[PDB]
A paper describes a structure:
In Gram-positive bacteria, nitrogen homeostasis is controlled by an operon encoding [name] (GS), a dodecameric machine that assimilates ammonium into glutamine, and the [name] repressor. The structures show FBI-GS binds the [name] C-terminal domain within its active-site cavity, juxtaposing two [name] monomers to form a DNA-binding-competent [name] dimer.
Thus, we next obtained cryo-EM structures of apo Pp, Lm, and Sa GS to resolutions of 3.16, 2.85, and 2.13 Å, respectively. Interestingly, overlays of the individual GS subunits show that the apo GS subunits are similar to those in the FBI-GS-[name] complexes (rmsds of 0.5–0.8 Å for overlay of 400 corresponding Cα atoms between GS proteins). In this conformation, key active site residues are not properly positioned for catalysis. Hence, conformational changes in the apo states would be needed to generate an enzymatically active conformation unless these enzymes employ a catalytic mechanism different from other GS. This suggests that they could undergo conformational changes during catalysis. Thus, our structural analyses indicate that GS enzymes from low G + C Gram-positive bacteria adopt two distinct states, the active, TS conformation (herein termed the “A” state) and the conformation adopted by apo GS/FBI-GS-[name], termed the “I” or inhibited state.
Numbering used by the authors:
A (entry chain J), B (entry chain B), C (entry chain A): 4 to 58, 67 to 82, 87 to 370, 385 to 444
Write the structure that this text describes.
């Protein structure tokens, strides 16, 4: 898309307002709404926001991200954050991912695809409009109505996403009660992260329209399956998958093996980025279909890395520890950098486990492991690395001092 | 606009009623509604009201302020208050600002632009229609729905303002929960103050339609960021900005430096006018993004005066201590006179603070400082000066004797 | 009293427990209860407490303060606070008053009497036992039952105080509804301050037995008379009043005039100590029988200093600005030092006002005036002076940022 294309779209679609939206370090999408009479100012990269209020900057819209919300008509553009000197801000996760991809392109790889699959819960709202603790239904995996009561809301979400240009693959009820999954096809790295960001807000808006609250919190309830955001990744060097070997019986190139070796070797280091909440490690517990051991397998369900049986152009590596609360840009950049480190150091792959280190058990331990990894620092840059560590340390210190109801139930009558 | 233009508008738009509205000393907009059959009497400056009931007078409409409320169709005219002898009333803030501008024009300056940016809170209404203490949402800076629940109300306010001829620039959620900001571009001094007055009433009218209460109180809640009304001001002598120097690397003329020197030197004096409430000084406290130190900077966030990095015709000076509860005419006249004092006395500018007196801490201290400044007395004239001081002194005396709940919580059990 | 007297009292009265009680800088009485089996340890000045938890110390009981609470039987001793080296702690208000009296004795004055008269309100308790905002009755000055419903509680307080060795003089309903006053005769400075401390706790304990809450808060409610703790002061040099002149028609010595001159001259300085609360200056407002002007009179009701018409050995000077929330030791020491300053500088007295500086209007202004006065610093010593200033500054900073209900009632709908 060019400026002329955007102008033509604005005139012919009668777009009245523009939403310039971007993402902070915590993965929260931030936006400012602007009347279409400021279209020329927006297209000249002259829009300005504060920056000090977000975890003197400029907004540079990415014109390929133009899309109209089908709910005054509003269109949106996903913008990169630049400084006053015309250079991209080093603390912007999206510009970070772009430059990581640019560094990848020097190794001969021309593309990096991401197929995500986030899961979410639906909770009922009260009369005041606040979410309650009761799920929308008590359905199970692949359940249908009236056992699956989220069928109408899920259908409306799919309908709204299709109007916005998504390529939806499947939709179904998930294992936990009130848990749902909508699948969309892979895209390029940047547009896949944009798809995740847009998908979360579309899901939340349409769920609110249905008197429901949608949350991507990893483990909202104890004793119930958590939500994951498995990352399917594949490398390409020119209209061809770099992971697929049409000669060996297994069908994986040496590049695919080195990528897996690098991801496995650096998995402990990027866990904090891929699992950024304190709640994220209540999901990484045994017995709930969540990965907590660093291993890979081609024929098995719950190692850290699973290589699906499909081959050809669909040959991919699935990292299963990513949760929907993670920042897609930072997590994808960390995974890509770990894989590229494995590629360029020619690491040998441990034997697949078909029947072994451990992921960090808490956010504090993951932060400790993140400070000791050199690959994650290079993946994130100095600014994002330092801000993430400082904010997560403050968050953990806030969490560390709380007294929970579990403690008052076990103690206070026994002691 | 002429009389013929107004008559043509009344016939062709089928206007049924006229709202002749003006502003008192406290910034409250007052009006009387008149059937369109009295249009000739209105245009002949023969409208009369009491005057003794407002903090034997004639209304003189300003025909350029014609606008129709898009919600019997009603149009409005902003009127000046005249005495029975045909001379403007010395206690009318709008006529005061007009004559201050007339005095400024004798110095060679032909224009004075004001770009304001007021902020407001939205509170939920109860069943009886009274505002509660519960904010409309719990969103943050640049937040979006469903975290930003004021999106629809803000969009309707913007839509309603655009029909009235405003040029809206941006709208977004503000830092505090339930705090919102809608930005409109600068205009001439008188019409900018008229824009502020119209903006407040449009916001308050559209909020009621959404079962919400809009308030421009500076600090409605403790522990929460307050609302400001930063004043962006620039001087012109004929289709060219007098603050812009395209020779120096900094890009500011000597005139811009003397204006800043005058505003800084007289900043203590006009604080009471720019912060006229007792609540205004609960916002002027450290740690909440509010100015409390009399200093200027070009590259910094929170001095009293901020000079934005933009240059050319958009070279401005931002006075950041003005709150939305201030009377726009009186505050703008005070700031203009303070700047012109430095212009005509060639005051030298203190060095910018990039890493120092203090603003008055209470309304009583601000009133004490106002009685000791000659520039504010010359800016407001004798009548407005005396009435403002008397009314604010009475208000402070009423506030001083109250016993708050904080006092009964700290004491009453300890003593 | 000697150690043998205390042992005899403990054996013959069958005292089971001892309360070693002392006063912190804020006037709050602190105590620890000890079984009578530790009587020898208590009498050997070997009792220890923390000190860091109170606004490694030793307790030295003052044996003359022995008294038994008539409500296991408990007696108490008022203790001085000493350091580990056997010297009195410089931050103890009682030891401060003792050394100020010792310094006074070098001037030839052998005694210093104080007649206090604190006033208190009575508030009804709810079912949970918390105080409410409704007064016990709606009686007035010198009112009787059933208009005065505090008659029984006041009688029980008087009965309990008489068993404890008080010499009660009068008890009556006060001007404000629910306000009461019980008078006891003067004593020496240290024992008068001990009487005030004991009186407050006895009143608060007995009121609780009547399902009432007793408070010595200066101004608990707006629009209603506040509570004062007038200090009646007289100097003696040997079984004779130094203020009484049997030859002059008025009957006041030059010493009495110089004492008044000193107190008037230093009145602004010690106001913060005598009025230590933020609420204290809601009482110091015109129209409620409270002093706010620094002047003296012999025949008038409301100057700052009143000299009662009685002469002989009962010739006294009444300072009327002290409220019952003040620390009696610190306020008495400040007043004594202020008077002695005039005594030793031979200050001339301003003419009595029978029909003029102004007391500080807020706690902040009183603290500012405290830092500029050397007599108060000499009276309190360095440690108490600095601790009081720091704590009151923090308290004022906490109060300054609150948003009261008055502000939300005046504003929030007007703006």
């Amino acid at each position: 898309f060019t400026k002329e294309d955007i102008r033509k779209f604005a005139e012919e679609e009668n777009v009245r307002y523009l939403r310039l939206q971007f993402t902070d370090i915590l993965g929260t999408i931030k936006n400012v709404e602007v009347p279409v009479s400021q279209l020329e100012k927006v297209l000249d990269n002259e829009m300005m926001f504060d920056g000090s209020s977000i975890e003197d900057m400029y907004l540079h819209p990415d014109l390929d991200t133009w899309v109209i919300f089908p709910w005054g008509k509003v269109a949106r553009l996903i913008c990169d954050v630049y400084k006053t000197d015309g250079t991209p801000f080093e603390g912007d996760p999206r510009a970070n991912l772009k430059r990581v991809l640019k560094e990848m392109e020097d190794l001969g790889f021309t593309d990096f695809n991401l197929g995500p699959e986030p899961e979410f819960f639906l909770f009922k709202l009260d009369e005041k409009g606040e979410p309650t603790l009761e799920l929308n239904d008590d359905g199970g995996y692949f359940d249908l109505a009236p056992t699956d009561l989220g069928e109408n809301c899920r259908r409306d979400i799919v309908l709204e996403l299709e109007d916005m240009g998504f390529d939806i693959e499947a939709s179904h009820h998930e294992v936990a009660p009130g848990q749902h999954e909508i699948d969309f096809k892979y895209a390029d790295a940047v547009t896949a992260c944009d798809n995740i960001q847009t998908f979360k807000l579309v899901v939340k808006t349409i769920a609110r329209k249905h008197n429901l609250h949608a949350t991507f919190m990893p483990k909202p309830l104890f004793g119930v399956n958590g939500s994951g955001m498995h990352f399917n990744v594949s490398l390409f060097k020119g209209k061809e998958n770099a992971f697929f070997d049409p000669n060996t019986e297994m069908g994986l190139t040496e590049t695919a093996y080195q990528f897996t070796a690098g991801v496995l070797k650096n998995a402990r280091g990027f866990t904090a980025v891929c699992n950024p909440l304190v709640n994220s490690y209540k999901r990484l517990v045994p017995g709930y279909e969540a990965p907590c051991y660093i291993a890979w397998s081609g024929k098995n369900r719950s190692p850290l890395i699973r290589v699906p049986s499909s081959r050809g152009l669909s040959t991919r590596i699935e990292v299963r520890s990513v949760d929907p609360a993670a920042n897609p840009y930072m997590a994808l950049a960390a995974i890509l950098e770990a894989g590229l480190d494995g590629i360029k150091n020619k690491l040998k792959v441990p034997e697949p486990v078909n029947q072994i280190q451990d992921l960090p058990s808490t956010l504090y331990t993951a932060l400790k492991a993140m400070r000791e990894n050199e690959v994650i620092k290079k993946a994130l840059g100095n600014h994002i690395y330092n801000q993430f560590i400082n904010s997560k340390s403050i968050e953990w210190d806030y969490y560390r001092t709380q007294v929970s109801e579990w403690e008052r139930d076990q103690y206070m009558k026994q002691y």
